């Protein structure tokens, strides 16, 4: 068994789409459509549905806000740079909450940023 | 880059572990304490962190409620046999929101469950 994906429910489809992608590096999966239940997925990651844990981008037709609340915490994903991946995504719709530098008492790097829709991501960086 | 974990907070650390585990089949991986900023956290999953997604949960001392939101939507597991875990689920502190069945339109059977706190679980029954 596995961890398949995480869903998280967007303001803006192509908003999220090119975040993820584009400034995060994942790549579109997948996408789908519902007139049933009226809405629009788009599946992005780093590696296919079948060998990694994903996230599921929901949008729901002509619903373009959610509350966050203070449950759901964050997804962390690795990087190579932490400090180019915050000036690259506070200069393409998202938000720095927490500049790269090391967790104190601790020498691993790590930063805390926002996605275009207030969501919370975790990252953290794998003789200059 | 890779996706490495997605944060949950929780109302009682133990609680959620047990049931990740013993109820879903994942192992606790590591657990850690913060006493300066009061909370605990327990790393749950089916494989090593090296090398897939695995479950944060996070455990904020006095604190055993939060406000869900709209925002969240869930995570994806893959399981190895749906309608036995939503059985196991069912009379071990939990709910079925969706009992074990074909997805519409598919094959593929699929169910949704709540964990002790209220969290959606999408059970999934599913190179080489
Ligand atoms: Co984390
Ligand atoms: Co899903």
Same sequence: chains 1, 2.
């Avoid at 996230?55 to 962390?76: P, R």
């Amino acid at each position: 068994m596995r961890l398949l994906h995480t869903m998280l429910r967007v303001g803006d489809l192509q908003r999220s789409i090119d975040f993820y992608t584009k400034v995060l590096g994942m790549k579109l999966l997948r996408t789908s459509e519902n007139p049933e239940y009226k809405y629009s997925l788009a599946f992005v990651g780093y590696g296919p549905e079948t060998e990694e844990a994903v996230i599921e981008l929901t949008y729901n037709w002509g619903v373009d806000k959610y509350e966050l609340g203070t449950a759901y915490g964050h997804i962390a994903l690795s990087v190579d740079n932490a400090a180019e991946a915050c000036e690259k995504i506070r200069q393409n719709g998202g938000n720095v909450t927490r500049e790269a530098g090391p967790v104190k008492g601790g020498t691993t790097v790590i930063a805390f940023v926002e996605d275009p829709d207030g969501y919370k991501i975790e990252l953290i960086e794998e003789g200059n």
